[PDB]
């Protein structure tokens, strides 16, 4: 503390040297000295007790200390920590603003990484320094308390410390009228941290808080209005009831603060419209202010002069701007007012899309895109004019105009594909393919994403141009960076999903596969760049089907290795977590999905590969995995392999079914769906041998059917599975026919007459023959299910007729008359004519 103190001071002066090499070499020393027990004893000493040396040196040591708290604080001796905690609280409100801010950031850091409860008398001291007549001590404590409330937004406790916000919050509200704007801004910032959290200490002061907010509403300092605006936005959700009286006064206030001097204030005031547009009373209040708000929102969607510099041209900007916030606000408002928003948009929109200034024109196109979803039914008449114009905007000289044009066109893709292909679709697809190979990297991703969107709405409408589409996409595999390669992977994979088996042509495979095999061979099993590639190949393998035969073996082998290694590393981590790290299961999930692609694509051709491999054992380990997505992907592989090669899956049914029966829990939808679908596919292959496995599966399935909410995809899948289960073993399914048939019929009556609908109904008829007692009570639903059929197969029709006539003979021609009269006309007439 005297013979080694100058040894550190010289390192502080040397660390401030303008030489780059000298800096990093000394910074390393302060890490090699950090491993000493009382090295941090010096850093805090220089900051507070060494008031002889210059300020930037004293500050630097305190900031080196701070970095020695954000790291290596787990090894911080309690004796030394007690020293720093005491010295900082002492020098709160130091004369030098540089030293004070250095001290303040130490307190907020120690209380952040190190926990708050480990510093007991932190809040009681800071909250008692707010009354100090020394302004610096007041600001220093208040500036720290703000960062504490931000870092510790929780620790509201309500029974952990003392609920310190019972004294702090009422004290905070008193500082809303303090002289200094810097103090007022602090006071409002602290309270705002406990608005959404429904703080009981603040909610019983909600009247004093709002009244104090109205006073600070017209403050000069923008940092005050910034916080006041944020507070009102938050109060719009949690305590809407206390704003209705002063509602229109606030809306006007927010409407001016949206056009505020400080853009920072303008953003927070703009979030008010997003919040308000999600409230039930929105469509009642804003109607008055609509003609005055709409142009303000649109005008804010223009590119600022700063953005046009960051975005070169005449992802380098923030995630949230005034532009994106106004775009979002206009998006949501469009879905609230629907077509009633058009009279406020269409006039100014007409004078925006054909404007000569590119900035003003670009913002106009964005407006057209934002209101697409909501005002769709009102924009359709204006589309035959706008759509051909936007396709021309794809050829604009400006880059930012071309990119936004791709996106706006993609939001009307549903209408374009509904129209004749050769008027909109063909020129749009052509011009969009041109922007994929654009010179500007930003326009590329915009078009490649827009094209991927176009492919989903068009599907088989792109089959004629499938050679034109592929030539552009494949060529794009040579001039694309790693950022846009992801979008390309999506566009290619989406194409295969859209055109389906139409992609299975020799000339297509000849150009589409070699670039994919290129990336395949250049990546190692640890590179996370495999995730987008194999997801793409999963769609391609499913589409190419048998055309994927010459590529199956090297793909199949590597996928098994990925799953096997991921599971092996998982076992190692489970045994010794300290020596072996946990593996990324995304490698396993992705590899399993590609295996499903092969099984679904090749079918029986994968039989030789499923055998001579341990994929069955690996799947058995994947189904037990903690991660639901892993279980989701493995169950999907089980079903696809059930159809492909059941002769290899059959010896493992005994241990598969109990796991399948366990994962019939609707908490994880996708897991429950794939499990249910797997059971159904297994039932077909088993036959009457499915008998012992039914009781541990059926009870869940019936529960899922009668279960409220739930997606239709799970209801349909559960009905088909039960139907397939009833077809193979009627004895163990028929007695419970009485209690699932009501939602069973309503679920399958809206499905087209396909194979899945056939096998399900073929089962409901089999367990109606056995125990017909269950269909009698709710026979109204079975009729509507049968009358939904247009062209059922002959044997299934005979089954329907034999059941309907059977019921008709049970009740008589007179009872059947009165019973059939409650049917709608087309349903009543169909049953009479068909059966």
């Amino acid at each position: 503390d005297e013979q080694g103190l100058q040894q550190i001071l010289q390192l502080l002066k040397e660390s401030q040297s303008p030489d780059t090499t000298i800096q990093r070499t000394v910074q390393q020393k302060l890490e090699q000295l950090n491993q000493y027990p009382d090295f941090n004893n010096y850093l805090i000493f220089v900051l507070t007790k060494l008031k002889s040396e210059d300020e930037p040196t004293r500050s630097l040591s305190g900031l080196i200390l701070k970095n020695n708290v954000k790291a290596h604080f787990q090894n911080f001796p309690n004796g030394v920590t007690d020293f720093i905690k005491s010295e900082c609280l002492n020098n709160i409100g130091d004369s030098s603003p540089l030293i004070r801010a250095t001290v303040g950031i130490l307190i907020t850091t120690i209380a952040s990484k190190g926990e708050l409860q480990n510093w007991p008398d932190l809040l009681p001291k800071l909250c008692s320094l707010l009354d100090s007549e020394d302004y610096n001590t007041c600001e220093g404590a208040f500036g720290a308390l703000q960062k504490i409330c931000e870092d510790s937004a929780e620790i509201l406790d309500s029974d952990v410390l003392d609920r310190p916000l019972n004294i702090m919050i009422p004290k905070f509200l008193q500082f809303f009228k303090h002289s200094s704007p810097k103090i007022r801004s602090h006071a409002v910032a602290c309270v705002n941290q406990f608005i959404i959290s429904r703080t009981q200490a603040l909610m019983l002061h909600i009247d004093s808080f709002i009244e104090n907010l109205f006073a600070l509403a017209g403050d000069e300092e923008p940092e005050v209005r910034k916080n006041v605006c944020r507070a009102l936005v938050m109060l719009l959700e949690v305590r809407m009831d206390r704003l209705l009286p002063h509602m229109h006064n606030i809306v006007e206030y927010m409407l001016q603060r949206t056009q505020d001097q400080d853009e920072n204030v303008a953003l927070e005031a703009c979030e008010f419209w997003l919040t308000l547009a999600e409230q039930p009373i929105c469509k009642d209040v804003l109607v008055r202010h609509l003609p005055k708000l709409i142009p303000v929102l649109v005008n804010g969607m223009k590119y600022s002069d700063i953005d046009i510099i960051l975005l070169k041209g005449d992802d380098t900007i923030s995630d949230w701007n005034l532009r994106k916030c106004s775009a979002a606000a206009l998006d949501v408002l469009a879905n609230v007012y629907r077509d009633e928003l058009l009279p406020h948009i269409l006039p100014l929109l007409k004078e925006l899309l054909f404007h000569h200034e590119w900035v003003v024109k670009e913002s106009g196109i964005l407006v057209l895109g934002a209101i697409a979803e909501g005002c769709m039914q009102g924009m359709i008449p204006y589309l035959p004019e706008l759509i051909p114009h936007l396709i021309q905007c794809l050829s604009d000289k400006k880059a930012l105009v071309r990119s936004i044009t791709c996106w706006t066109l993609s939001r009307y893709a549903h209408w374009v594909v509904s129209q004749p292909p050769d008027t909109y679709l063909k020129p749009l697809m052509t011009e969009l393919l041109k922007r994929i190979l654009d010179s500007n990297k930003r326009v590329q991703e915009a078009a490649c994403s827009a094209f991927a969107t176009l492919e989903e709405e068009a599907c088989t409408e792109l089959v004629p141009y499938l050679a034109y589409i592929l030539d552009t996409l494949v060529f794009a595999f040579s001039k694309y960076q790693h950022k846009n390669l992801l979008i390309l992977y999506d566009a290619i994979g989406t194409l295969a999903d859209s055109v389906g088996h139409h992609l299975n042509k020799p000339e297509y495979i000849q150009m589409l596969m070699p670039p994919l095999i290129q990336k395949w061979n250049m990546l190692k099993d640890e590179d996370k760049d495999l995730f987008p590639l194999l997801e793409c190949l999963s769609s391609v393998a499913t589409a190419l089907q048998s055309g994927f035969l010459p590529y199956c073996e090297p793909v199949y082998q590597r996928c098994v290795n990925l799953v096997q290694k991921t599971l092996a590393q998982a076992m190692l981590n489970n045994a010794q977590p300290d020596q072996y790290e946990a593996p990324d299961k995304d490698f396993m999930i992705v590899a399993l999905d590609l295996l499903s692609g092969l099984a679904e694509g090749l079918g029986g051709n994968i039989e030789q590969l499923v055998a001579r491999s341990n994929i069955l054992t690996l799947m058995y380990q994947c189904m037990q995995d903690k991660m639901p997505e892993v279980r989701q992907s493995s169950f999907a592989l089980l079903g696809d392999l059930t159809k492909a090669c059941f002769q290899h899956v059959k010896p493992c049914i005994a241990d598969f079914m109990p796991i399948l029966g366990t994962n019939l829990n609707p908490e994880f939808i996708s897991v429950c769906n794939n499990a249910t679908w797997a059971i159904g596919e297994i039932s077909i292959q088993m036959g009457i041998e499915m008998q012992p496995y039914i009781p541990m599966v059926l009870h869940q399935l019936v529960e899922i059917i009668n279960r409220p909410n739930t997606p239709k995809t799970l209801l349909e899948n559960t009905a088909i599975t039960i139907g397939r289960l009833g077809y193979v073993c009627p004895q163990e399914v028929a007695p419970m026919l009485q209690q699932f048939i009501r939602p069973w019929c309503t679920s399958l009556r809206n499905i087209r007459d396909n194979e899945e609908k056939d096998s399900a109904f073929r089962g409901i008829c089999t367990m109606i023959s056995v125990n017909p007692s269950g269909v009698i009570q709710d026979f109204i639903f079975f009729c509507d299910a049968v009358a939904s059929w247009i062209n059922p197969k002959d044997d299934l029709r005979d089954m329907f007729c034999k059941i309907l006539h059977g019921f008709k003979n049970q009740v008589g021609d007179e009872n059947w008359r009165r019973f059939s009269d409650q049917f709608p006309l087309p349903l009543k007439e169909r049953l009479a004519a068909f059966y």
Binding site: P532, E535, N673, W677
Partner: peptide, 17 residues
């Protein structure tokens, strides 16, 4: 129809949908 649930969307597909 029913079948299996769609695969997990990645960064790109989720960004547009």
């Amino acid at each position: 129809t029913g079948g299996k649930a769609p695969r997990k969307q990645l960064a790109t597909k989720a960004a547009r949908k």
